[PDB]
Structure 1
């Protein structure tokens, strides 16, 4: 909710993308990705409550949005296995990161909106 929030929209139906699985990982010292947090988007296509200010320290993070299962459930053949968003969290910046993703079967866009 507070420091990291994910929002997913469906460009085909013009709707929130509901029940999309989302996994967050943090990069470890041996360069592997450690599970950090996960959830499914709500009816408003949002996922809040992933982490806390205390836990969300500087580091490299990856957000993986399971887009292929979403399109499969709709009966629409998709290109990507999942959308991945990789970034370094930085304390000098604003306190709240919203990772937004706009999905189509053969294309996606992602935007970070970083606010105080």
Structure 2
């Protein structure tokens, strides 16, 4: 008897992000997983990933160059921060 009870009774106005999981039981491999449930990615950069079997195997001249030079701006007043009866403001 696996019984899970979450926030069963709520009187009022709560701000919430419920996450409930119940389980009863050649290069990169994954299995039976829960990923990114509430994941938040901002300005995420992947350049060279899982290129392959035998990549650049013989006589490979390679010049790699990452030039991260940008007037970039990110302004998040509430990230994954539920809020009740409040005042949120990005004043810019």
Say which structure is richer in helix. Answer: 1
CA contact (8 A) 1:71 1:77 kept: no
- The whole-number CA distance in structure 2 between the counterparts of 1:13 and 1:75 is 55
Gaps of 5+ in 1: 27-48
Shift of 1:96: 52
Q: For the residues of structure 1 that align with 2:35 and 2:3, how far apart are their CA atoms?
A: 16
C-alpha distance in 2 between matches for 1:112 and 1:82: 57
Q: In 2 relative to 1, CA 90–102 (structure 1 residues): closer, same or farther, beyond 3 Å? A: farther
Unaligned ranges ≥5, structure 2: none
The structure in which a higher percent of residues are strand is 2
Per the alignment, do residues 77 and 55 of structure 1 end up closer, same or farther by CA in structure 2, a change over 3 Å counting? closer
TM-score (norm 2): 0.14
Q: CA deviation at 1:13?
A: 3.9
Q: Tell me the number of residue pairs that the alignment of Structure 1 and Structure 2 aligns.
A: 91
CA RMSD of aligned residues (A): 22.2
Q: CA deviation at 1:22?
A: 2.0
8 Å CA contact 1:100–1:112 kept in 2: the answer is yes
Larger Rg: 2
Distance 1:111 1:9, change over 3 A: farther
Task: State whether residues 11 and 103 of structure 1, in contact with CA within 8 Å, keep that contact through their aligned partners in structure 2.
Answer: no
- Cα pair distance change 1:86/1:99, threshold 3 Å: farther
Greater alpha carbon shift after TM alignment, 7-16 vs 61-70: 61-70
